[PDB]
Structures are given as structure tokens and as C-alpha cells.
């Protein structure tokens, strides 16, 4: 292996060795002491405890994560990031780091719990962890951290995706988890103004409930957000049929009707005038 042929974009010096037997991997709960400089000026001082791959939402250069993913237990060192592996072109305000800049990072990796890989865990474990993760996805969400919530609910769809050595009991326990995941994803996306993704998640979910109140609903909100009135009308009109006493379904269904007839009226008068104009133009003989 020994990938690292990012041509020294990411380089570290083991200031202080430190026991260690294994390294932090994808999605691992890392506890770390951070010190990063530009030119030689300090912009970041703090001891963050985050999940690897979560760094983007925590003002940390892409490169800094792959570096950490190559440390010991209580190891110390420093990372020198070439422009392409740290805020790069977009630079980074609130730290005012001009585009195409380099960085210096002095990081001390304390503890860390590696993220179990799909292969490592048997049927039940996947279900347990699928739970542990969702719990988090839940917190991050009610906390307004939608992107990080995404990170969580996804791990679930991942782990449970292939593996099917599930007893009929776990088969549906896991299916519930999946459905839950997809519904929650759609929820985040809508928050994130990512309506295409919202709709793709509703579909993955309705492939599991095709009657689901939330999926059918959330998909109507997404169509409606991007002026997909007709498609929306369809989803709200259907949610009502399956759940008459559904609050927003009725109102939203109304919005569609409104926007649709006004739309109709508009495009009607157009052809009307377009028609007239052709006539007069045709009369020219």
C-alpha cells in the first residue's frame, strides 16, 4: 500500500513518538490538540474532539484529516499542507487565508475510537451500531448541524446495504432502520435546500413503504420548493387520500392549485396573443 503519493502535499514530522499500535480511520471519534499557522501566524488554537470526515464543518483543511489518519496513540507532530490540501483556491475567510496558500499544523492525537468497518461486525452488531449512529444523527439534527447529521444517517444505509445474512427477525428490524435512515436523510436535505437529493431519499424510502406519510409528504415539499407544482400536487393529493387528517397536506395541496391555475391562466393568454399575431402576420399577402 503506502498510498501517499499526493506528492508531499501532506507532510508530517514526528515531534514526539508515542506508543500506538493502530491508527484512526474513516469516521473515527478523534480527540486532538490543534495548532495551525499560515506564513507563521496563528489562526487556529483549540483541542477539538470530532469524527474523521467531519472536519469540513469544523474549519479544518481537507489535508489535516488524512494526516491524522496516520498517527499513533498519544503521538505528536506537525503537518505542512500544500495549497491544494487546505482551503486551497477558495482560501478561507474568518481566518483570512488567501487562495492557494500553505499551512503549518502541530497536532497531538490523544485517544480515538476507530470506526468499525462493515466487515468487522456481524448481523446484530450492524444493527446496534446502526442505532448508535442514528442517535447521533438525531442530536446533530435537532442541533441544526444538518451536514454532520447527513454523515451519520448515511453510515447506516452503508453498513446495512449489502449484508443480507439477516434472520427474518433482523431482516425487518434492519429494514426499519434503513427506512428510518432514508426518511431522515430527506429531512436534512430539505433543510439544506438540496431538493434533488431530498427527492432521491424519499424514493429510496418509498421503495420500502410506498405508503409512508413522511416520505410521500417530504417529496411533495421538495417538488413544491422547485416549482414542480404538478408533481407536488400529486404527492399531496396522495398523502390526503391515505391520511385525510393531515395538516400541511391540505394547505400545501392548496398552494399548488393556486400556483397551477395562475400558471394556466398565464400560458393561456400567451397562445391567445401568439395566435392573434400569427393571424395579422398571415393576412400579409
Amino acid at each position: 500500500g503506502s498510498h501517499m503519493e499526493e506528492d508531499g502535499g501532506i507532510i508530517r514530522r514526528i515531534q514526539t513518538r508515542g506508543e500506538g499500535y493502530a491508527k484512526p480511520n474513516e469516521g473515527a471519534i478523534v480527540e486532538v490538540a490543534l495548532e495551525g499557522y499560515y506564513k507563521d501566524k496563528l489562526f487556529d488554537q483549540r483541542e477539538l474532539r470530532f469524527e474523521i470526515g467531519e472536519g469540513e464543518n469544523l474549519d479544518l483543511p481537507y489535508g489535516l484529516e488524512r494526516a491524522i489518519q496516520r498517527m499513533e496513540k498519544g503521538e505528536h507532530s506537525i503537518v505542512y499542507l500544500k495549497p491544494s490540501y487546505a482551503f486551497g483556491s477558495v482560501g478561507k475567510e474568518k481566518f483570512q487565508i488567501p487562495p492557494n496558500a500553505e499551512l503549518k499544523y502541530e497536532l497531538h492525537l490523544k485517544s480515538f475510537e476507530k470506526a468499525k468497518e462493515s466487515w468487522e461486525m456481524n448481523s446484530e452488531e450492524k444493527l446496534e451500531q446502526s442505532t448508535i449512529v442514528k442517535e447521533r444523527g438525531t442530536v446533530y439534527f435537532k442541533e441544526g448541524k444538518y451536514k454532520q447529521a447527513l454523515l451519520q444517517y448515511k453510515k447506516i444505509v452503508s453498513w446495512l446495504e449489502y449484508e443480507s445474512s439477516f434472520s427474518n427477525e433482523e431482516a425487518q428490524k434492519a429494514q426499519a432502520l434503513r427506512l428510518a435512515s432514508h426518511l431522515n436523510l430527506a429531512m436534512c436535505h430539505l433543510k439544506l435546500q438540496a431538493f434533488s437529493a431530498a427527492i432521491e431519499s424519499c424514493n429510496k424510502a418509498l421503495e420500502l413503504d410506498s405508503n409512508n406519510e413522511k416520505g410521500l409528504f417530504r417529496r411533495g415539499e421538495a417538488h413544491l420548493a422547485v416549482n414542480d407544482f404538478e408533481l407536488a400536487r400529486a404527492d399531496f393529493q396522495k398523502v390526503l387520500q391515505l391520511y385525510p387528517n393531515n395538516k400541511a397536506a391540505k394547505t400545501q395541496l392548496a398552494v399548488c392549485q393556486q400556483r397551477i391555475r395562475r400558471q394556466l391562466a398565464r400560458e393561456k393568454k400567451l397562445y391567445a396573443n401568439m395566435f392573434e399575431r400569427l393571424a395579422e402576420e398571415e393576412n400579409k399577402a
Binding site: 438525531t138 428510518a180 431522515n184 395538516k247 400541511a248
Partner: peptide, 5 residues
């Protein structure tokens, strides 16, 4: 749990 609405 999932609520809100």
C-alpha cells in the same frame, strides 16, 4: 424519537 410535525 422523530417528531416535530
Amino acid at each position: 424519537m422523530e417528531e416535530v410535525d
